[PDB]
């Protein structure tokens, strides 16, 4: 029941305007502009009520995207539609920028007319949109394209052909960790997703398998999937079966909290010498095989607010003390497993009030590692196409694990 859909820029101008219901008028755009973009207070909510009228807004790059309704619309549905439309526009023309919107004006208006009709979100998987939306022939291909837009299998187009049946698997994870100094893990959480890039011909029936037995096996608390995968089969017999849409798509999402392998062990050592000098040394142990090279490693060591000088000593890598962040940022380009590194730091403290004790913030660390912290490994992935003659052996499979750190903090 999306009454109207508007897009603004950072200046405040209306890049595009489209209204689907009479109840929404020209006043809604002005009200949103005066109330949300130019709001005096920064404390808001994603959805706001303005004179018996609801506005949903999300921000992509420097571009505002808003949807206005005067009915009791489903909030989650509207937000998911906004995300999906952002994804579709990104799939067409990359970055969602002002000049991109200006240049592709007709294309975005085609999308607005098609993917939504009288406030009811229609098919928007952009697999079918490529077929009949550009930037003759006979009834055959026309009925084919109409059925593939409206039918059950809407994500994949009928006439996909390739000379090299290859697919790409990407296991992306973000870890949230907060370790207590007493050796007890106070909070653990791993969020992951499997991104699949498929270049396959026909309508393959793909089976995805992993170590989800519930000699490597992990206990996943729950799995949240894509649309293309059949959820009824997953519930009935614990099988992941899907037809991969052409191009990139997010196959599944998973959450893990047990049996988490720690990439590193943080041992902080703080020595207090009166009120002038502070000795802090941090040593990290690489708990993985040496064949894996850790990359983009960032260690953030907090410093007292009354620090007058910081000395950096490092044998491997470089240690940077930046006053802009008021912390010591220690970066290492690469090292292998079962390696160690040490830093010597001298903290000179300016005079301050004796009453004010120092509440140490946690030591935040950022890293990217080739291994998956949860331990999820793709055991197999079967592909079968009855219509064509290529077998599973003809298909070439690739897998990559990129585990990026999320909120990785260490109490000191």
């Amino acid at each position: 029941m999306i009454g109207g859909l508007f897009i603004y820029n950072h200046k405040g101008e209306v890049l595009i305007s489209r209204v689907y219901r009479d109840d929404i008028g020209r006043n809604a755009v002005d009200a949103f502009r005066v109330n949300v973009i130019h709001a005096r207070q920064q404390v808001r909510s994603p959805v706001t009520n303005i004179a018996r009228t609801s506005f949903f807004h999300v921000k992509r790059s420097n571009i505002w995207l808003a949807a206005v309704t005067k009915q009791n619309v489903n909030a989650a549905m509207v937000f998911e539609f906004l995300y999906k439309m952002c994804d579709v526009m990104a799939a067409y023309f990359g970055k969602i920028s002002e000049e991109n919107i200006k240049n592709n004006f007709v294309l975005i208006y085609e999308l607005l007319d098609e993917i939504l009709d009288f406030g009811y979100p229609q098919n928007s998987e952009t697999g079918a949109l490529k077929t009949f939306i550009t930037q003759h022939q006979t009834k055959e291909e026309q009925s084919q394209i109409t059925s593939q837009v409206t039918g059950q299998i809407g994500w994949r187009r009928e006439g996909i052909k390739y000379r090299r049946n290859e697919l790409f698997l990407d296991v992306l994870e973000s870890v949230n960790l907060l370790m207590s100094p007493q050796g007890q893990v106070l909070s653990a959480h791993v969020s992951g997703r499997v991104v699949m890039k498929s270049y396959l011909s026909g309508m393959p029936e793909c089976k995805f398998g992993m170590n989800d037995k519930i000699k490597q096996s992990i206990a996943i608390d729950d799995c949240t999937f894509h649309q293309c995968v059949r959820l009824s089969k997953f519930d009935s017999e614990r099988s992941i079966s899907f037809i991969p849409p052409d191009g990139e798509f997010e196959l599944m999402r998973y959450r893990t909290t047990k049996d988490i392998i720690l990439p590193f062990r943080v041992i902080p050592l703080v020595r207090e010498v009166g009120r002038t000098k502070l000795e802090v040394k941090v040593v990290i142990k690489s708990n993985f095989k040496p064949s894996l090279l850790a990359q983009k490693i960032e260690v953030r060591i907090p410093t007292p607010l009354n620090t007058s000088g910081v000395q950096v000593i490092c044998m491997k890598g470089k240690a940077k003390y930046k006053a802009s962040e008021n912390a010591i940022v220690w970066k290492i380009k690469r090292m292998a497993g079962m390696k160690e590194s040490q830093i010597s730091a001298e903290i000179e403290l300016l005079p301050t009030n004796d009453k004010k004790k120092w509440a140490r913030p946690p030591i935040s660390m950022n890293f990217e590692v080739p291994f998956a912290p949860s331990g999820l490994k793709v055991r197999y992935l079967k592909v079968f196409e009855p219509k064509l003659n290529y077998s599973d052996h003809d298909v070439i499979k690739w897998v990559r694990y990129i585990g990026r750190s999320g909120i990785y903090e260490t109490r000191c």
Partner: peptide, 5 residues
């Protein structure tokens, strides 16, 4: 990056 599956 890419490893054989």
């Amino acid at each position: 990056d890419y490893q054989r599956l």
